[PDB]
Every structure is written in structure tokens, then in C-alpha cells.
Symmetry: C2
Subunit: 231 residues, 2 copies
């Protein structure tokens, strides 16, 4: 119940869905959580208010992703918030959760170069550059958790553009796990699915991976699909 | 933490190594643990004595695995012990950890029918039949955890006979996950790591008789409620050794 006391976590895209449920659960474990958002401040403030009502600690951090200066702006807000609350800029846990999505999907014949650019800029390139920046603040024993998708393993034509970016995200997991092993920083992919579930079901898996007891899991693909990947 | 208060667990082959470490960690979470052994009673009793010193509850259960009658003998001892302590025969958690291992490499040209039979009898057939019997006692929220091996993903010719049985074990995970999902029972593989000659962690444990506690901490997580959205999965607990 209090496995992350004194750790600092950044959850990208934590104003809603899996990001919100993950911020909530890390904060219940004692983590100070930076609740990153692009522009919905009301939803970010809802996440922070939920955390504070449950007795935890969190603050909102604003940064549009996939645009010039995004990593710099996010880390300026993050470092200022961490320094005010902890006296340090230490980042123990990074969750790459933020993503451009299209729930109604795009037929492959209608995908534009500009859509391919936007999906890539947020869902693959930003996470790579956030990892690169994060490890400058991350001590030995740190955690990087990449939220992927069961779509990397289950063909859905109308989600080809999103799935491409998650294929690229998973390569960050494989290659950076090997790179960061000597520092004892783990890198893992958690794959949600595409019985009624909630965002909390996946967030409980992310929370476990953020703890000390996951130390022997790195470079892994963690199927949190509720068995939807089974066939 | 007390995530497993009032739960009953069986860990096969818990007299040493990953099995002992898993029995210890389930008991620390509040589970009543059946500490199964084939013949090393002294080591099984030391698993149980460690659990009791740490304030938890456990009892030894004897059954040679991979012979006719093995499941029936194990379940007679399990149900008697559970009923004595709790009034019930409910089994919440099964860890299929017991295995015959390639402690020595066997060159593929030297593998015998008898070796193939012994590896399969213990490492694939017994777990299948233990799962079949266990689910008769297992409620909604149950957990079945198959201890596999990174050798199912890393070519080591001298371990081909052992690795075949782990390949079959992983198919129990896939097909039984889908079968038992309507009862809210999850089935998962946890794969310990490997280290001229390449061995897995269970093999290194046997040679010295990838630390057993690090793998057992993963198994313990899978045994808890917070793993409910993971089923049919391969959980890499190789300490990064599957990265190469």
C-alpha cells in the first residue's frame, strides 16, 4: 500500500483514462505525481483534486507534445514543481502514456502524410526524447514504463497509423532496457486491450512495474489486455 | 503488505530455490502455503520453519511427481492440511514450480527416450493434471502460475529435452487462460533467466545445491488481485538475460 514513498513520477497524458488511473495509483503508493496535460486543464485539475482527496500529492504540468520545445517546456514545469515540493529535481518514474488517437480510426487509403507526422511526433519521437531527458534526473533503480497497445499484435486496418507509432515505442523498450541495465533502470512496455474493465485494471499493472518488486523485469512486453490478445 | 489474507496456496517443489522463495513471499502476504516436496523432507521442513519464524502459516505435503497417482496423493495431503487449519479445501493459488532440470547439458545426439519421458512426466503432464484437479477447488479470483524458462526463447542445444517440456508448459498457460477466464481464474507463465554452458536459474539452484527472490517477487505480484488484467501471458523475469 506504500511502496513509492519519496519517489517522484511523471505520467504524460494523465488528465484522463489509463494516464489518470495510473497517476491516482502511483500517488496512493506515496509517489509525488506530475500530472502532465496538453490543454485540458480542468481534467488535469480533476486528477490532482482526486489525488489530494485520497491523501496523496500531485501537481499539474502543461506541455503541448509533438511541437518545437515540447521536452524543454515539460521539464521546465516538472523541475520547478519537484524542486518546490521536494528540494530536488530527481525523477524516479517516467510513464510514457500521452498519445494522439482516433477512436473511429482512419481507413489506410485516407491516412495523410500530416496525420503520419502528428501520430509519430507525439507517440514515438516525444517518448524517445522524454526518455533521453528523464535519465539525466533518474537515479539507479529508476523506472521507465511505455504504454503500448495490443494493436501491435492484433491487426486492425483503421488503426494502422496509431499502431505504427506503438511498434516504434516498443523498440524504445527493447533497446533502452539493454542500454540502461547497468544503471539498474528498467524499461518495459505495458499493452492494454484495444467482462467490463476499467482504466484501473491496466493502471494496477503499471503501478506494480513502478515498484521495487519488478526489478527483474526489463525490456519486456507486459500483456495487460484482460486476455483480449488470447484469441 | 497483506494482499493474500485468507488465501490458500500450493507451491510445487518449494523445498528450495524459486519455490522456497515463492512459498516464503506468499506466506508473508498472509497466504496459508502448502510446501510440496517429492523426497527432500528436511528442506521442505526448513521452508515451513522459515515461514513460521516470520509469523506466517505453512505445512509440508509430499508427492513424487511424474508417476501414476501423483495428483491424487498430493491432493489428499493438501486437502487434509487445509481442512485441519481452515475447515475448507479451497485452493486460491497454484504455482507449478516443481521440475526435472538439465543440471548437466545432454548433447542432442545422447538424449534418450527415457530422459524425454521423465522431463515430460514432471514438467508438462503433471502440471496439466494438477491444473485440472486444482480448478475443482478454486473460486473466482484464483491464480495459476506456471514457472517456465528463458530457454523457450534462447537456443541451447544441450537443453533441448528440458526446453521441449517448458514449450508444452507455456501452451497450458495460453489455452487454459482462455478456458478459465469465465471463472475469473488467470493463468500466466513466469520465465526465470539463463547464464561455455548455458543454464536457467532452476538448473543453477540444483548445481549449487538471477536470484530466486527476484523471480519469486514477480510470482507473488501475479498471485495478487492487482494482476487481474494479466492472463495467458509470458512474464519475463530473466533480469534482462533474454535481451542477450
Amino acid at each position: 500500500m506504500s511502496r513509492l514513498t519519496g519517489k517522484n513520477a511523471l505520467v504524460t497524458g494523465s488528465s484522463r483514462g489509463i494516464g489518470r488511473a495510473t497517476a491516482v495509483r502511483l500517488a496512493r503508493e506515496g509517489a509525488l505525481v506530475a500530472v502532465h496535460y496538453a490543454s485540458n486543464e480542468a481534467a488535469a485539475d480533476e486528477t490532482v483534486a482526486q489525488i489530494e482527496r485520497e491523501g496523496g500529492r500531485a501537481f499539474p504540468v502543461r506541455a503541448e507534445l509533438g511541437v518545437a520545445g515540447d521536452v524543454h517546456e515539460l521539464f521546465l514545469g516538472l523541475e520547478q514543481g519537484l524542486k518546490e515540493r521536494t528540494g530536488e529535481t530527481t525523477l524516479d518514474i517516467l510513464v510514457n502514456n500521452a498519445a494522439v488517437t482516433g477512436v473511429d480510426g482512419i481507413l489506410p487509403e485516407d491516412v495523410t502524410a500530416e496525420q503520419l507526422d502528428r501520430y509519430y511526433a507525439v507517440n514515438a519521437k516525444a517518448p524517445f526524447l522524454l526518455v533521453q531527458r528523464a535519465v539525466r534526473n533518474m537515479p539507479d533503480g529508476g523506472r521507465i514504463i511505455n504504454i503500448s497497445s495490443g494493436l501491435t499484435r492484433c491487426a486492425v486496418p483503421e488503426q494502422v497509423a496509431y499502431s505504427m507509432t506503438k511498434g516504434a515505442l516498443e523498440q524504445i523498450t527493447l533497446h533502452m532496457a539493454k542500454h540502461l541495465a547497468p544503471r539498474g533502470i528498467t524499461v518495459n512496455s505495458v499493452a492494454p486491450g484495444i467482462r467490463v474493465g476499467e482504466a484501473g485494471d491496466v493502471a494496477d499493472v503499471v503501478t506494480f512495474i513502478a515498484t521495487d518488486e519488478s526489478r527483474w523485469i526489463t525490456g519486456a512486453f507486459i500483456d495487460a489486455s484482460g486476455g483480449t490478445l488470447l484469441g
